[PDB]
Amino acid sequence: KSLLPKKEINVYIGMSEMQVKWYQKILEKDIDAVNGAGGKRESKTRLLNIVMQLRKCCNHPYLFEGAEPGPPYTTDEHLIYNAGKMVVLDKLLKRIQKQGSRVLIFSQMSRLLDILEDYCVFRGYKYCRIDGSTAHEDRIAAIDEYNKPGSDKFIFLLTTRAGGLGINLTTADIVILYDSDWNPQADLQAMDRAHRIGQTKQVVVYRFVTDNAIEEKVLERAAQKLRLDQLVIQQGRAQVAAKAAANKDELLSMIQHGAEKVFQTKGAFGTMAEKGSQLDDDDIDAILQAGETRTKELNARYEKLGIDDLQKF
Amino acid sequence: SLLPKKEINVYIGMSEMQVKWYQKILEKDIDAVNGAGGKRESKTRLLNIVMQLRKCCNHPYLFEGAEPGTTDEHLIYNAGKMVVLDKLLKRIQKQGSRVLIFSQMSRLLDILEDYCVFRGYKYCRIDGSTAHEDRIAAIDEYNKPGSDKFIFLLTTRAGGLGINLTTADIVILYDSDWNPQADLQAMDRAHRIGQTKQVVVYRFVTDNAIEEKVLERAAQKLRLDQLVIQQGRAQVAAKAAANKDELLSMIQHGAEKVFQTKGAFGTMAEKGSQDDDDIDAILQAGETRTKELNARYEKLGIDDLQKFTSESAYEWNGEDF
Amino acid sequence: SLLPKKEINVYIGMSEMQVKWYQKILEKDIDAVNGAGGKRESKTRLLNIVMQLRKCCNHPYLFEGAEPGPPYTTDEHLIYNAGKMVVLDKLLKRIQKQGSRVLIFSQMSRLLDILEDYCVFRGYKYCRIDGSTAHEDRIAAIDEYNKPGSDKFIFLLTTRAGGLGINLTTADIVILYDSDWNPQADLQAMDRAHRIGQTKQVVVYRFVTDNAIEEKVLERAAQKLRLDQLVIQQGRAQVAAAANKDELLSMIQHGAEKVFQTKGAFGTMAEKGSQLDDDDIDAILQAGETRTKELNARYEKLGIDDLQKFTSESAYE
Amino acid sequence: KSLLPKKEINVYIGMSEMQVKWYQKILEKDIDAVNGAESKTRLLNIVMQLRKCCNHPYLFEGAEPGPPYTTDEHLIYNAGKMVVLDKLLKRIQKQGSRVLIFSQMSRLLDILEDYCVFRGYKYCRIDGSTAHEDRIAAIDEYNKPGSDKFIFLLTTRAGGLGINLTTADIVILYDSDWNPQADLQAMDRAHRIGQTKQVVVYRFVTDNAIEEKVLERAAQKLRLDQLVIQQGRAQVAAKAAANKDELLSMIQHGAEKVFQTKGAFGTMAEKGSQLDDDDIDAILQAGETRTKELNARYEKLGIDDLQKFTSESAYEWNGEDFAA
Amino acid sequence: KSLLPKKEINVYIGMSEMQVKWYQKILEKDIDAVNGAGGKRESKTRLLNIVMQLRKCCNHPYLFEGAEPGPPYTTDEHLIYNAGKMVVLDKLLKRIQKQGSRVLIFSQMSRLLDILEDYCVFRGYKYCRIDGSTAHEDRIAAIDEYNKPGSDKFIFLLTTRAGGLGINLTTADIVILYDSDWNPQADLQAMDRAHRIGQTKQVVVYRFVTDNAIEEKVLERAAQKLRLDQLVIQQGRAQVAAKAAANKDELLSMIQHGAEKVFQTKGAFGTMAEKGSQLDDDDIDAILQAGETRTKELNARYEKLGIDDLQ
Amino acid sequence: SLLPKKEINVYIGMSEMQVKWYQKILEKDIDAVNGAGGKRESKTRLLN
C-alpha cells in the first residue's frame, strides 16, 4: 500500500528572558573552559557537563532547582512563556488538535516529560506516557489505551530510549521531537512509530531546535553522523557485491557474448581476417591506437559511478 | 618520481583454427549454452565451458589433437594473440625495452618457451610451481646488471609478494585473472620503487568473444574495490567521539550573542511570546532551512566528513573567545 | 576533470610599526621568551605571547592605541602599516585585472573588520561570513557571490565559519591571510572553491610572516598534515592483522601436485635418505639462511598497498 | 649490557616416504574441498591434518608399526624433521650448546620425550600442564651451574611469564605458531636480559608443503603488525599538543632578528610599501620555490622512519603471555 | 487491532531411501570421529563438519555432487520423492493453495531454494524469491509484487538471513521453515514477516524436522536457547526494578502509611499503649514471638515470587 | 560449620511524645502529604 514519505521539518525556536539568564549563568560558572581550555584530559569531561546544562536550559529553565518562582509551585501560564519551546508547542498543539491530528512527543529527559504532564493537565489534554522506568505490561497497557478505536487520548509523551522497542503507534500522525538525541538513528527510530506500514495519513515530524544556541550546532553534527552512517551502509553494499562470486546467470551471459558472431564466421575471426599474418608496423600502430581509445572508454564508464550510484552495476 | 603506468588493452581477433575449436566447444555443450539447465544444477558445467573458451582465446594447441599431427611459423599464426605478440616483441627489442609476460596457464608458457626458442630470445621462467631457490636465481639472473635475458615468462599469481623485476619496463598480460588485483600486482613487479623508465602494460583481450565480457566484470570488480577502500574511513569516523575542538565549537556557538542579549532570544524576544500567522512564518522559514541543510550535507563525500587525527590536537584559539 | 589546486606560500616581512609592537610583546614578558622560570608554569603564559605575535603578524591595528592618533581616518596607512596588506593590495589588484575572484580567509574576525574597511576604501564589492553570522544570512551571502554575473569580487570568511559542504566555485583564487593550527581547517577552506563545479585552476596563496612566529607555526602544521596522511594511508593495516577461503585453499594446494607425483620420499629425504653427514647438514643450513634473508628482505620492505587484500579476492570463482 | 641479536634461520625440510603416503591420503580423503568446491570448516580440518603429517606420522593412529610399539630408529627416519633434528642436536651438543625445543602440539613433545630417552639425552619439560613447583624444579635443574640436562622441551603456548632459560643458546621451533608474536616469546626465554652467548633460532619448515606457505603468510602479518605499530606512533604524534618547549621554539624563532631590526623587517624593507608587478613576481617565484622545497622535506617521511619514543617492534616480544 | 496468535507446528518427516544411503555414507566417511573422539583440538572442528553435511542430507540429497541420478538431469517426480521434506511439502502445498492460503518458505541454504525454484516451476506455482545477498532495489521489487492487491504469486522463497530486514509480507498466512536456524531468534524473526501488524488471518507456521535424525536433536537444543533468551530478558527487567529509585508516588505511600491512625491516637502507640513503661519480660517475649511470626510471614510473601513474576 | 543467623523484625510503637512529633511533622507539611505538587517538582520536599 501507499506510504507517504514523512515531512521532517526543523522549527527554529528562541529563548525566553529567563532562559537567557540561565544560559548566561551556565557559561559564566565555567568561562575558563569556554574561553580557552585546560589540560586536554580535564577539558573534555568539564565541557561535556556544560553541554548537558545548556541542553537543559534549551529545554526548560524549571529543570534547574530554584528557578521557578518560590513555593508554593503553582501551575499557571508562567510554565509556558518561561521556555522557548513551550510557546511554540502551545500554539502548535492548539492547531494540531483542531485539524483532527494526534501527536507523539518524544524527549531525552524524563524530568521534562514531568513538566509536559503538568502542562497537559493545565490545558486539559488527555495523554499517555512511557518513561523508560515503565514496566513491560504497563508499556502495553499504554499502547492499547492510545490505539483503541475512538480513543480519548491525544498526546503520547515518551522518552526517545523507549521509542525504539518495537512498539507501533500508527494511530498518531504527528511527531514532535522536543529535543534531539545524539544518535540520529535513535531519533529516526522514534519517528518510525507513526511513519510505518499501517499509517494512513501524512506523517509530519517537528524537530525543535533552539536557534543560535548549542542545539543549532548539534543539528549540524547529527547531520554529519546521519550521512556517515549512510556511507557505511553503502560501503557494505559495495563490499557484498565485490565479494560476490559469479552467479549461474552471470556465467551464461559471458559465454553467449559474441558466440553468435563466431558461429556465423566461416573463414577467419576479427583482426586476423583484416590482416592475419606478418604484422606490419602500421597494422599494429592501428591496433594500439584503437585499443587505447577503447581502454579510456572502459575506465570512463566506471570511474563516474561511485557509491551513491551503486545499484547500477 | 615514479612515472605513472600506461595500461593499454590490445583487442585481438582469432585465427581460422580458433574459430573451429570455439564452435566445437560451443556445440559439444550447446543446450547448456542456451540456458537449458535447471537452477539446482552445479556451476561446474557452466565453468567448464568458460575454461575451454578461454583456452581457445589463448592458443588452440592447449587442446590435445588440435596442433597438426614441429616448432614453426604455424605456432605463431594459429593464435591471434601470438601474431600480435610476435611483432610487438620484435618492436620492443629494437627500442631496447625489456618485457615481463604473465599468463594464467602454465601450459601456455610452455608454448611461449618454444616460441622464444624459435625466435632466439633469451628468457627465464617462474611457473610459481617452481622452487624458492630456483626462482631466486631466475629473478637475480634477470636483474643482474648486464643481464643476457630479454623476456621473462611468468604466471600471474606465481612470484609472491614484493619481488622486483623493475629492470623490465613493459608488461604484457596475455590473459586476465578473475580478480583484478592479481593482474594489478603483476604490473607492480615492474612499476615499483627502483624503476627508472616508463612502465607500459599491454593486456591481450580477445574481442567480441568471452574475454571481452570477462574484462568488463573485472573492470567492475576493480571499481567496487576502489569504493570499498575509499570509504574505509567511514567505519572509523561514524563511531568517533567529539574532540575538544568539537565540543568547544558546540558550547561557543551563539555564546557571544547570549552574553550580549539582555532581554530574550530571537523568536521570543522580538515577538514577545504572543498568531497563527507568526507561527506559520516560523514553520515556513524552518522548513526552508531544513531543505538547505539536507541538500548541503546529503551530497557530501568522505573527504569532507573524515576527521584527521591532527584536529584533536587542540593547541590554541583563533579568536581567544 | 578537476585540476589539482596550486598552493603557494607567500613569505612576507613586517612593517616598521610591526617591529616596534613585535619587540614590545617580546619585551613585556622577556623572561618567558628566554625560557626562564619554572618548568611547572602552566601553558597559559606562553600561549598569550603566541596570540599577541599572531595578531601582530596579521595587523598592528588589532592592538588598541596602535592606529595613528585621534581623530581616526581610513586611508593608505591601513595598507602600509602591515606587510601582509601591502602584498595583498597588489595581489588583489592583479587578481581583478585577470578576471579572477578571490576568497579571503582568516582566523580573527577583527581582521575581517580591518579588511572590510580596506574593501570599502578601494571600492571592492564583497560578501562576508563570520561564524557569528545567522544561518539565513550566510545562505544569502553564498547566493549573492554565486549569482551569475555577480557584482561581488572578494569574499571574506573565517576559516571555520560556513560549515561543511558550502560551495563557492564562482571563485578560483583563495587567500589565507593567516593559517590554522590544524591543517584540515585550512584545507577545508580551499575546498570551498576547489570542488566539483569549479572550472578554472584553483590557486591558493598562504600569507606567511617570514623569519617570525608564523613561519615556525607553519612547519608544525605541515608536519601534522604529513602525520595525518600516514595514518589515513595505513588505516587498512589493523583490519588485515581470519583467513580467506583462497588463503586456506592456497595453504593446502601449495606443493600438493608435487606430493601426488612423489612415490618415495620428498626432497631433503629422497636425495639423502634419512642419513646425513656433516656436509649435507651444512648445505641445509646455508640454503635456509639464504632463503631466510631473501624472504625477510622482501617483506620487511613492503607497504600497505602490497599487503592489502582486495575485497574482490573473496569472490572465489 | 651487550645483548647479541638473535640469528633466526629457517631450516627447510622434506618428508619421509611414510609422510608422503599420509600427506597424499589426507588430500585424497577430501579431494573435493582441495579442488575448490565452500565451508572453511572442512578446510580447517585438512590444514590441521597436514600440519600433523609435517610434524610426525605417529601422531596419526595406526601409523606406527603395529603392537608392540617399540622405540627404535624408526621413530626418527619416518619423520623428515626428526632426521634433521637428530643430527642438529648431535652437533649442538658437540659445540657445548644447549637447546630449548618448542612445539604447538604436546603429543609431539611426547614423541620427543621417547626420542630423548632412546638417545640418552637428559631433558626437562614444561607442558602447560606442569605444576608451578614442578616447573621451578625443571628451571633450576636445567640452569644450575654444571647442570647435567641438555634439552628442554616446552610448548609454545605453555604460558610461562618471565621464565628464564638463558643458560641455553639455541632455540628450535619444531613447528610454527599462526601468531608470530607467540614464537617470539619462546625465543625470549633464552634471548633475554641475562643472555651472554649468541642466540641461534632454527625454525623447522616442511619445504614444498603447507608449512612453507604458512611461513610466507606469517611474514605478511608480521609486517602488517609493524605497520599498525607505525600508524599508532604517527597517530599519537598527530594528536599531540605543543610542549612548553615546542611553543618556546615557535616564539623564539626570529625574535633576535626583530630585536636586531631598527627600521622595517624583510619584504617591507626590501621594497617598501609600494610594489610593482616585478616585485610581486619575485615574491611569488621564490615563494612557490620555497613551498616545493618545504613539501619535499616532509613528503619523504614515511611510516618506516618515525620518531619512536617507546621502542616496540613486531619483530620482538610483545611482553604478552601466550597461555592458550 | 486483533492479531491472532501464530500456530507453530513441528512437522516431523522421514527420509527417502536415497537420503538414508547418503546419511549412512556421511556417517561412515568419518565414523571414528562420530562414535569415539579425536583430539579435543581436532574433534570439535571435525564434528562441526559432520553436522553441516547431515543437515544437507536432511534437506535434499541433490545438494551433493553426483547424487542426482546420472546427468543429464530432469525435473520429474524424482525431484520430489527423493527428499522426505519435499514429499511432505508437495502434499501440504496442494492443500495450502486450495484453502486459499499463500505461504512464505524459508531456508538456510540458497542451493535448496534453487531446488525449490525448479520444483515450483515443475508444479506451476507462481513465486517470488529473495535470496541472501540480493540487490536492495531488486529486494524491494519482490515485496511490492507479492503484496500488490490481486497478486498472481502464491509462494515466496526466502533465506532466513534475508528475513529480518524489516520487510512486511502480511498478505501471506502460512510460513514454512524448511530447515531451522541454530539461533532460535533468527527463525522467530522469519515468522514476523507474516505475523505482524497488518495480518488479518490466522498465521500457521510449519517447522520441518527430520524425525529420528540430527534435526530432531537440534530441536531440543534450540528450545533451550529460546528459554535462556527469556531468562536474560527477565533478568534485565528485574535488574532495572532493583536499580530504580522510589517514585514520588512510592514515597507518598510511605509517608501516608499509618498517618491517619497516628492522627487518630491521643496517647501513645501500639506497644507503648499496651504497656508503655519498663514492664515484664513476658511483654518482651510477646513482641519477639509475634515479631518472629511476622518475619516468617513477611519473607514468605517475597520468597514466593520468581523470575517469571516481576508483578 | 557456620550457624545460620536468626533474623527477627521486632515491631514497636511510639511514646506519647513521638505521636506528638509524628503529628507535628505531618501537620506542618500537610499539603505534600496529600500530594499537591506537579510531576515536575523534585523529590526533595517529600524526601525531607
Place this chain on the structure above:
Amino acid sequence: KSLLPKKEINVYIGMSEMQVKWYQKILEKDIDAVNGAGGKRESKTRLLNIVMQLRKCCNHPYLFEGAEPGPPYTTDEHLIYNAGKMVVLDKLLKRIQKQGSRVLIFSQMSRLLDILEDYCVFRGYKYCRIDGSTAHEDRIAAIDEYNKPGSDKFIFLLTTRAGGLGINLTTADIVILYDSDWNPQADLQAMDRAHRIGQTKQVVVYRFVTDNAIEEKVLERAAQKLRLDQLVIQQGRAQVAAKAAANKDELLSMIQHGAEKVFQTKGAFGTMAEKGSQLDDDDIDAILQAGETRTKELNARYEKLGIDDLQKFTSESAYEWNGEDFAA
C-alpha cells in the same frame, strides 16, 4: 637468584593550610553534586570533575592556576611547605640519600614532575626523566645511563604510564608512587622497574596517600579491585581444571587402582566375600550405614578445598606485574 620481596608501605600525609583552602574551594564551587541531600539525580560527569580536581589538590595546589603567590614569582621554600606530600618527600629524600639509596619517583601527572623538577634543581638533586614525550634516543640516553657505575644521579622522575616495556632500573632500590593509579596493575608495572630480575637489594615502595581525604578512600577502593582480580584469576584456574580431560597418567591410576588386590584375590571380592548370597537386611543395613559414612567423608574432603587453594600452574598474581605496558 634471590629477588627480595618488595616492601609496599602506604605513608599517610596531611594537607597544608593552602591545600585545605583549595580543597574547600573545590567542594564549594560544586556543593550541590557533593551533598546528594536533595534530588540525587546529578550526573556522574559532574562528579568526575570534582574527583579530578580533588586529586590535583592532594598532589599540589600549584597545579591550580592563580594559587601560587603573585609577582614576584620565585622558586623558594614555598614550593615544599605548601604541599603535604612535598614536605614528607623532602625529608624522605634527605634520609634516603644519606643511606646510599637511589629512588625512582612515579606520578600520574607529568605537570607534577614539572614541580618536582623545579624542586630537584632547587635542592641540587641530580635527576633524569621519562614522560612519554621524551624520545627513545633520549630514553636510552638516560635510563641506560642512570644505571652506569659512579652515576651522578639520585632521583629519576617518570610518569606511571610512560609505557617503557622491559625498561629496567634495578640500580635503584626505592620506588615512590607520589599518586596512585585507579588500575593497581599500572602501579605494579612502575614498581617492576626496580623489583625485577637483575635487582640485588631490597626494593621498598612508598605509596603516598592523603589521609582523611579522597586519596584514602581510593586506596580502600583499590584494594577491592585488587582483591577481585585474584578471584577472577582463581576462577580461571578452576575453569581450566574443570574443562580438562583425563591424561594417560590420570587414566593409568584409575586402571591400576586395586588391580593388585584383584590379582591377589582368588575367591570373591569385597562385599561378595562377606556374604555373596542374598542374606539378612542387617547386612544391607550395615552396607547402607557404611556407605552413608563414606559419602559424608568424601563430601568433607572436597568441600574443604575451595577457591584460593586451587593448584598453581602459572605464577600469576593480582599483586604482581601484569606483563602489560601502560600508556596514558
